[PDB]
Structures are given as structure tokens and as C-alpha cells.
Amino acid sequence: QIPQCAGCNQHILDKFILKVLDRHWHSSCLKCADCQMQLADRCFSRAGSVYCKEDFFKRFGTKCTACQQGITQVVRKAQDFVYHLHCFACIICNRQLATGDEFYLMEDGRLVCKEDYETAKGGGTPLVAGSPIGHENAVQGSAVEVQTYQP
Ligand SMILES: [Cl-]
Ligand SMILES: [Cl-]
Ligand SMILES: [Cl-]
Ligand SMILES: [Zn+2]
Ligand SMILES: [Zn+2]
Ligand SMILES: [Zn+2]
Ligand SMILES: [Zn+2]
DSSP, rough: OOOOOOTTTOOOOEEEEEEEEEEEEEEOOOOTTOOOOOOOOOEEEEEEEEEEHHHTTTTOOOOOOTTOOOOOOOBBEEETTTEEEETTTTTTOOOOOOOHHHHHHHETSSSEEEEHHHHHOOOEEEOOOOOOHHHHSSSEEEEEEEEEEOO
């Protein structure tokens, strides 16, 4: 089926069809709201608009998953979730997780150290704590893929 552009809602007759996480785009509609630059690498969307990596970081403040508050300091990451270092902590024992620590990530971003998770015997994802990283590397935009309507 010929997709309608997520941006302009028109049918995309371009041979190349850009796909951003389950949505389809004209190449010419995937442009940063700020600097009007084509988005070929990846896409940063907030609210109802799209931005490049640079213009996005300078516009929106990344909010910690646990405390829901802004963070120019290094952060911790588990999957897509982003945390203050002091919020990267087990919800049961309140102990801060450190690089190398084994923990479980719950669906809503709640963190549980390995020992407390396994002691209590819902569904958690096993992970190993990575070292702190910068915001830039923290929030990786959505991948822009390319599809073509073929026979
Ligand atoms: Cl398609
Ligand atoms: Cl074409
Ligand atoms: Cl550490
Ligand atoms: Zn379009
Ligand atoms: Zn831009
Ligand atoms: Zn926090
Ligand atoms: Zn714990």
C-alpha cells in the first residue's frame, strides 16, 4: 500500500520512501523545524515537530526517568531510559548502581539490583550498568530507514 506521509499526510509517490519508526515520510518532508535541513541520519521528534540532533539538544531538556527532572552533566542509561547518576538506583534497597553492577530494568524504567530482584523471585530485563556518558550520546534519535514500493 502507498503510505501517506507522516508529515504532510499526502500519498507518497516517491520511489524512495523514508521510514521513521513505523511511520513513513517524503524525503522533502523530513526536515528540521529549526534549520530546515534534510534529516538523512536520524530523527529527533518532540511534540508535533522534527529536529536534527544539534537543534534538538539546544531546545529540549532531557528529563530523568526516575525523578522526571532536567539534567550538562553525565547520565546513566538503561535501554531507552535516561537517569541522573544518583537516580540510577535500586528501588528496593536505594543503593546507587555503579558501572558493572548487575540489575533488572522494569518496563516503566524502575530499576532493581540483581540481589533484590532475585530475592523477591514482575517482568524485568537483565542488564549490566554501563559507565556514565554525555547527553549527546545519551539520547540517540530515531533511525531513518529507506523503503521502496517494489513489485
Ligand atoms: Cl511502504
Ligand atoms: Cl522518484
Ligand atoms: Cl562507577
Ligand atoms: Zn510529505
Ligand atoms: Zn536542525
Ligand atoms: Zn533523576
Ligand atoms: Zn537493591
